[PDB]
Write a protein that binds this ligand. Sequence first.
Ligand SMILES: CC(=O)O[C@H]1C(=O)[C@@]2(C)[C@H]([C@H](OC(=O)c3ccccc3)[C@]3(O)C[C@H](OC(=O)[C@H](O)[C@@H](NC(=O)c4ccccc4)c4ccccc4)C(C)=C1C3(C)C)[C@]1(OC(C)=O)CO[C@@H]1C[C@@H]2O
Ligand SMILES: Nc1nc2c(ncn2[C@@H]2O[C@H](COP(=O)(O)OP(=O)(O)OP(=O)(O)O)[C@@H](O)[C@H]2O)c(=O)[nH]1
Ligand SMILES: Nc1nc2c(ncn2[C@@H]2O[C@H](COP(=O)(O)OP(=O)(O)O)[C@@H](O)[C@H]2O)c(=O)[nH]1
Ligand SMILES: [Mg+2]
Lengths: 441, 429, 368
Amino acid sequence: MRECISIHVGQAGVQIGNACWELYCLEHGIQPDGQMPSDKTIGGGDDSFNTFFSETGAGKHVPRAVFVDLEPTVIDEVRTGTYRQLFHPEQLITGKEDAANNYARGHYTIGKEIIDLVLDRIRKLADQCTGLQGFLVFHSFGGGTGSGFTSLLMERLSVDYGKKSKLEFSIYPAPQVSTAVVEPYNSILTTHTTLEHSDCAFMVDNEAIYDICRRNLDIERPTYTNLNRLISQIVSSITASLRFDGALNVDLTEFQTNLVPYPRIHFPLATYAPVISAEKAYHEQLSVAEITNACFEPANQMVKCDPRHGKYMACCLLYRGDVVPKDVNAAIATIKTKRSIQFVDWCPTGFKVGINYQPPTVVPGGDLAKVQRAVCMLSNTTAIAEAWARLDHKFDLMYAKRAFVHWYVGEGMEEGEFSEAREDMAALEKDYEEVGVDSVE
Amino acid sequence: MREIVHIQAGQCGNQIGAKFWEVISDEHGIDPTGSYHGDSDLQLERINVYYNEATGNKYVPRAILVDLEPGTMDSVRSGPFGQIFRPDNFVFGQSGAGNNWAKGHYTEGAELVDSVLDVVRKESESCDCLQGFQLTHSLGGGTGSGMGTLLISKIREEYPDRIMNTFSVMPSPKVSDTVVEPYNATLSVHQLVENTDETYCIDNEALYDICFRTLKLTTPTYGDLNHLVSATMSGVTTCLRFPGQLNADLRKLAVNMVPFPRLHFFMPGFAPLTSRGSQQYRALTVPELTQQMFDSKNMMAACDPRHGRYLTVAAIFRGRMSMKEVDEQMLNVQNKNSSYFVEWIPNNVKTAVCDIPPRGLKMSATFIGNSTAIQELFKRISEQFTAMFRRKAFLHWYTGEGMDEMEFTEAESNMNDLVSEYQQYQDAT
Amino acid sequence: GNPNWETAQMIREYQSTLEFVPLLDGQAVDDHQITVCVRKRPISRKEVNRKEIDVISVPRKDMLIVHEPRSKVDLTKFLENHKFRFDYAFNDTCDNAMVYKYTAKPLVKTIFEGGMATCFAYGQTGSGKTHTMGGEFNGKVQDCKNGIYAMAAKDVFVTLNMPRYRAMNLVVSASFFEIYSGKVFDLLSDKQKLRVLEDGKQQVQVVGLTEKVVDGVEEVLKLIQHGNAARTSGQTSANSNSSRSHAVFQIVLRPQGSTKIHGKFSFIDLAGNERGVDTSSADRQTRMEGAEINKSLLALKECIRALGKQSAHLPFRVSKLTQVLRDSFIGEKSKTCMIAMISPGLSSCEHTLNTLRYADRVKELVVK
Ligand SMILES: CC(=O)O[C@H]1C(=O)[C@@]2(C)[C@H]([C@H](OC(=O)c3ccccc3)[C@]3(O)C[C@H](OC(=O)[C@H](O)[C@@H](NC(=O)c4ccccc4)c4ccccc4)C(C)=C1C3(C)C)[C@]1(OC(C)=O)CO[C@@H]1C[C@@H]2O
Ligand SMILES: Nc1nc2c(ncn2[C@@H]2O[C@H](COP(=O)(O)OP(=O)(O)OP(=O)(O)O)[C@@H](O)[C@H]2O)c(=O)[nH]1
Ligand SMILES: Nc1nc2c(ncn2[C@@H]2O[C@H](COP(=O)(O)OP(=O)(O)O)[C@@H](O)[C@H]2O)c(=O)[nH]1
Ligand SMILES: [Mg+2]
């Protein structure tokens, strides 16, 4: 049976893992103590699907999850919370000190000597599965372990596994609001191994989801509990075809074939249709043509990024629930008519529709409610290049002044590592200028 | 987990420290006898940080007390919490410093540092992993200026990779409680540039100002100036001890907060500070805490922050909050104050949000900020110093204890280079 | 035949594209208050037996270009044109005598004009530092006959014996250092930590420095046999050894009735972390001394760029390697030299570019 290995890294990765595994346990019926008392009433069905859940003989279910953060403070919430007895008790903590927001403590100093517990734990976990693999990595750019330790975890998993698909779901630094002053240093050093090893890098952002939680959801004070559920609804309908029974399922290998033209332009900028309130769950039809047109306006992109100032290359409409496959093509010939939704010449096909027909469920405790259908559009546009130039500019403004850099080179890393990461991002931004421009004859 | 050793030098040091371990105790819910009688189970997870265990359910702070020259001994022992410190830690001698630097660093310090470091090593190896060495000392004095910076010359020597925070009470432009005071500041800032990762510049005038201009206290005693310092001292290590939503160690601060290795002299703020009974005419919200933190009359270093550009600042928020009102209030201040910050840094402010408030409050904060406006605390001393040193005024009480004239010119050359590396970034470019 | 020939195929095509005007010995020397020396070593005998591609093109006397095997977004290989400007760009055909035009240097003339000057030696392992300063081009015993430290010893000692300069009655004194993690030792006695203070007349003096009034040329080169006696400072590695501290071998110009010095002349061994930092080694002493080398090297890069791009906040007390050498930089009739060794190989192309951009922070634009 096809399966994934969800490897959360950092505090951002573990905090998202609080709610991704809160969502999975409610869809399948698994209580916070491993049992399945929902399907015992009916008496049939293996709904704790082996994509995400190892099953032991005593009826208990164990996830495929391992997470490393180099700080006990985050995981001790998991080891004392509601999901204490659910997970396996090897949630790898062992950090005698936090990374302190740098890539050099990090890829080199304390990420090493803890990685020996990490890779052996994945080998003890990967060898229980027959069939498809895929590493669902969860981290953030800008942090210390989400940037540094993931970079060590990719070059040590692109060797012991080779050509396996790696979907890594990174939280990207916002161009206007940054919760650290050294976050432009970490989010340029982590690109040098995201570009090489991880085949598909889902970037989301915190400011573009703040506006969604204010405008659509109408929440005036959104905490980090209410942001991570919206990423959790996205991550569910990315790996929904591996579990549920759809009319057009899209495997994790079918992303790599479709979303990714060239081996170094894999940054596809997820979206969703979260216009539930749920006061506005009435007053509104929410048909197939409605939720597909939610991707038109740049007030619903999950990244602070304007798609109208760039081409598209390839999109991937992934539906949920009561979707009829006829209504989809009405909502696609419409989009290919609109002249600001701009494509390149070299991709005339455009779209790809994955219709799963299990409806998205509702986490009790807010903040949206039971809609009958959804969409998670994944589209690598050319417009993500202007989202990086507002981050190379933050790097270059404090690289001329030689600021903050004695805590990077005084931890094992050489000071020449920074310009090696600048010559990628200068040349990787140069790649998006060529691909969007068509050739004339 | 991550563990801190607290050292107390100078008579200013343990007086802050005796109030310090009362704020820490009531934050964890711990009685004078060390017996835990707390409300919840959430404040036992990091007792390990400040309080190592004892035999029957009792907790002892890892508090070395260098400063108990015996005039202060039987007041700290005969105090509120004299039955909480381990009595072998009370390390002292006889014939204290005499408001003299050379009688802290060269003569009585050399015959006491061996008895201190024999207890420092016995409190390091009773720990899983150390990072923190808090030193509560004061400039200007005797023990707190010569012997307080003799240990940092030794403890950083035996531990080159620990975060060394020294909450250094500094002299004042008007309040002159020591005649020799521009000597004990020049000779001690010369030590605290080389040997610390961070050091907090606290003055008594800006603590006298808050108790009159804001807290409206009739007679602010010395307890009520230390009760404001200690509310910052338990505000830097909050994310160590308590869970949060965006944690910050003593090292995520001191990697962000410091651009260049000499520019680590901080000014600490605190909010909410206000004066009431139980009827106060306001509302504790996230935009309410923000304006008070950045207000120029709620610093502690007694310099004008609008005279210079903030290099970078850190706002360690506590209590239950919302991260959008945190990340957007920290944005609008940076835009309204575009000249008051440094232009050539992307985002200056960082955020740190814990999840447990203080006992009585609903929310709180701590403004730790690195500014070029602290050039004024070093220019005033360097004018008072070269006025005294030109006449060779008080030097025969120092050269008569072993020093030389060529260490005084070494110390003023180092402090005058901080002012050069603060006037630069205060200028625009 | 060769597996990697194609990357080198475009390299053989690039060498006919531009105009090769290299550096020949005997050209004029301008002022150049701050010089940056970059030397390319020749191809060794092991490299041709290993299929090694030369990737270091030297087209000018002030320009050096390094190629790199990369790919487009269509998996199409091309060569990146790393374009660097030096002063002083040297060929691999350069013998040490052509380097003697520029490193047996006219700054020793500045020593005798009442000014002071210094010189640096930066590089990686297997790059030519074994043939320049700390041991020279000689083989099984690297003794000082063929490289810089021997020939500069003839520029200092023998030149002042001219009667214009011999009438000044000037003598020679030497003094060796050891710059550890905030520690300024002496190589005459290993257990002598000397404090760095400063007199009231604004001269940073290492307190209590022992000198020797020595000698002719043949004996002053044998002082390093006492200098490298301690094997500074406690190496524990694979390719033993590589110095963790830094050596400052000062040669001082002074008269006899003096108590008056002008013409301090110093050599620096910028030896650091060439091999990657063994963080698998759980020895805490390695990280505590391996870290402070890099922050000392960042001090020396940062200090010189504020000397070229002049300002009034000149960074000195970030470490002690700059603090000891504070007087020799800020002299009025003072100049500064800095040497960078280069490794030819493709397998060390990542370690070569790190050494090149280290010697780039004087802001030289490629006018071309
Ligand atoms: C009815 C009510 O809400 O009363 C408040 C109160 O009125 C005010 C004015 C308190 C009060 O504080 C002071 O008046 C004060 C006295 C000396 C030095 C500093 C302050 C209060 O005494 C202080 C007390 O603080 C705490 O309980 C905190 O946990 C605080 N604790 C201590 O400082 C402490 C005092 C005695 C014994 C043990 C601990 C703390 C703060 C930071 C870190 C750890 C602990 C609080 C909220 C109040 C009173 C009781 C009136 C204020 O101070 C603090 C520290 O909260 C002064 O401005 C704030 C705003 C509060 O609303
Ligand atoms: N959406 C979301 N973002 C988070 C969360 N926690 C942190 N972040 C963001 O992640 C970035 C900070 O990185 P962290 O993950 O906190 O850092 P870390 O990986 O623990 O690394 P160090 O603390 O530096 O060792 C900032 O941009 C935060 O806004 C979270 O729970 N949810
Ligand atoms: N905040 C505070 N300042 C103090 C206290 N006691 C002394 N001072 C200040 O400390 C300085 C005098 O040094 P002191 O600690 O008494 O001298 P020492 O015993 O030689 O270190 C002066 O600036 C005093 O205002 C105190 O309990 N609290
Ligand atoms: Mg963290």
